[PDB]
Design a protein around this ligand. Structure first.
Ligand SMILES: CCCCCCCCCn1cc[n+](CC(O)(P(=O)(O)O)P(=O)(O)O)c1
Ligand SMILES: CCCCCCCCCn1cc[n+](CC(O)(P(=O)(O)O)P(=O)(O)O)c1
Ligand SMILES: [Mg+2]
Ligand SMILES: [Mg+2]
Ligand SMILES: [Mg+2]
Ligand SMILES: [Mg+2]
Ligand SMILES: [Mg+2]
Ligand SMILES: [Mg+2]
Lengths: 357, 357
């Protein structure tokens, strides 16, 4: 059922937005139809991990079934708010990362009828919809200001995180708008510390912390949990989710992965790249340097090979276990004063640990 | 004076933002310096008409010099919020219109050390800065929810406007993501009505209504003015402003304007394009259709020529006249009940009417 009503409120939101376009922006049915397709293709098809979480927290915490209905609905709107924020990111990320496929279909900007320019602006419309939906449905909620501050910080922090990711293959000392510069040939920026920073901000926040917080907000229970504990947790699960994407991006088939991995070509600061570079010998490192950051498929075939070659899967299992115990400890601190919350945090974790997704 | 204090608070905003990056986002000095360049290069160098209006309205309406200061400072923050919104729109716009030059200098995405993928994100950071500064300075302010609502509506309206603009070369009946299509060969969509709509939503709202509103809010005088009248005035002055843009985009020399015009090449729905097509003969219309929407400079020179041929500069003057007496009428209807607002509106008009920029 959670999914049942989630989809129902999707329909609501779609109706209100599209109809509002119709009436108040002088929109013809064609463009209106365009945007319905855009919205279904970018927003739907996922597993709604972040959205559902928000409901799940709300329902755990709500502990006159009108209050039940109000929280549940709000939670669903918040859920879609996060899902549309994510859709906005992916539309724009795929463009920035020059990706081919997402979710099993082609990236939005790679549809035959969607120009790159229009995709950038469709990206922006998606972000704007989060605000429009929030303002409509929470217009007379006491928490609306706090929700919109929080949400905007996250989205800002996500963009800062993007700045890190997108500038990780340039030696940060040569960073200047006025003077051009090429892919780093010593990679001395590739470092776990740098990697951790990029992920914290580009992923952790809008993926793990924001769904938890929104669910608490609609529940009027945010002060009841230990935030410090919650923040540590979100950061941890978030980092471990990005690393999992980094490994899959190299070693899970695009068919099961519903995308094709561009980390090796984009010369990305992926987990496999940093972990290799801190453990590998000199000949391994010199091959790598000569075989990373090039679309060539013999050179791409080399790096992938070279990872397998130096036993990264092993490092990933140790990491995973290190994380998994650290999560278990933290959740138990959290159960002490907030059992209901800790339950739904566990569930979320349960959806992440050793995902094949 | 207004210009001096306006520049003071910029430095205040810049400092708080860049420092917050340093402290709360773990940001190195190189990347901090980058954002300082980007922020100066995109937010500075124009005449700050949108910004300054806010201050002007605010000063006009504030009729214990602490209150004066408070209102003046907020008016400066709001102003920079709109200016930073403008900078956002222009960085993204330039990329979407594939433009060369802006404000006498190269477009942000064209700068030698700025990648297209980085520029897209720098745009987004610009937007995020509007929220951050607002939340910092208006934290404790009663009107902060209202300001952020209104602000986001306008931002959303501006993106919808751009959806119209960007898809004005595609037969709208044939608009389908899943299916490709080329530039219209009949231009049946290039109508005044369609032009009007594009302009209304893409320019009028953030350029005229928004500064007027924000100045009102920080004065705590919004309910004092006829909003219906104010809205007419803004739409009207706004439409005109764009039409003035479209005419310079083809006749004003790039060094006078500080930007090379692309409306012809991109096959845009400009005021010249829709006016011509509604008046021109059969042969005129067919040469147009054979020479519009092409980088080729002989094809471009022909269109240009053809506009002068049809004396579009006569139609413009009549338009201008009609707008100027429509504006004069509305400003008196506003002067009746709110003579302080009316004065500041007339100053704004004063800056638009027969501008050369
Ligand atoms: C508000 C910031 C605006 C700039 C662009 C949004 C940042 C997107 C951050 N992000 C997080 C996850 N992803 C997508 C990927 O995970 P994917 O596997 O989908 O390509 P990645 O490119 O790996 O970060 C993007
Ligand atoms: C909300 C994000 C959507 C993309 C960017 C916002 C739309 C920009 C609105 N706008 C208004 C005026 N301009 C720039 C021009 O006036 P210029 O001629 O200076 O490039 P134009 O592109 O003609 O509208 C952009
Ligand atoms: Mg990316
Ligand atoms: Mg990507
Ligand atoms: Mg990836
Ligand atoms: Mg444009
Ligand atoms: Mg442009
Ligand atoms: Mg123009």
């Amino acid at each position: 059922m959670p999914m049942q009503m989630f989809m129902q409120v999707y329909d609501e939101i779609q109706m209100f937005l599209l109809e509002e376009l119709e009436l108040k922006f002088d929109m013809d049915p064609n463009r209106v139809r365009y945007l319905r397709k855009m919205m279904d293709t970018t927003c739907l098809g996922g597993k709604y991990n972040r959205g559902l979480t928000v409901i799940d927290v709300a329902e755990s915490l709500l502990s006159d079934g009108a209050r039940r209905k109000r929280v549940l609905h709000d939670a669903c709107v918040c859920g879609w708010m996060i899902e549309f924020l994510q859709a906005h990111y992916l539309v724009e990320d795929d463009i920035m990362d020059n990706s081919v496929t997402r979710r099993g279909k082609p990236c939005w900007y790679r549809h035959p009828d969607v120009t790159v320019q229009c995709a950038i602006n469709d990206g922006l419309l998606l972000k704007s919809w989060t605000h429009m939906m929030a303002m409509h449905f929470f217009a007379d909620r006491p928490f609306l200001q706090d929700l919109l501050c929080r949400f905007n910080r996250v989205d800002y922090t996500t963009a800062v995180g993007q700045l890190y990711d997108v500038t990780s293959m340039f030696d940060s000392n040569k960073l200047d708008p006025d003077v051009s510069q090429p892919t780093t040939t010593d990679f001395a920026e590739f470092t776990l510390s740098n990697y951790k920073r990029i992920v914290k901000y580009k992923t952790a926040y809008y993926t793990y912390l924001l769904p938890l917080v929104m669910g608490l907000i609609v529940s009027e229970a945010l002060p009841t949990v230990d935030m410090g504990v919650t923040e540590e947790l979100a950061m941890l699960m978030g980092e471990y989710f990005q690393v999992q994407d980094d490994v899959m991006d190299c070693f899970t088939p695009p068919e099961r992965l519903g995308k094709v991995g561009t980390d090796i070509q984009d010369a990305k600061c992926s987990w496999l790249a940093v972990t290799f570079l801190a453990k590998a010998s000199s000949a391994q490192v010199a091959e790598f340097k000569a075989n990373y950051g090039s679309g060539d498929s013999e050179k791409v075939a080399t790096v992938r090979r070279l990872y397998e070659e130096a036993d990264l899967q092993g490092d990933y299992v140790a990491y995973e276990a290190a994380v998994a115990e650290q999560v278990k400890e933290l959740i138990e601190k959290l159960r002490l004063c907030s059992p209901g919350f800790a339950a739904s945090v566990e569930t979320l974790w349960g959806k992440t640990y050793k995902r094949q997704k």
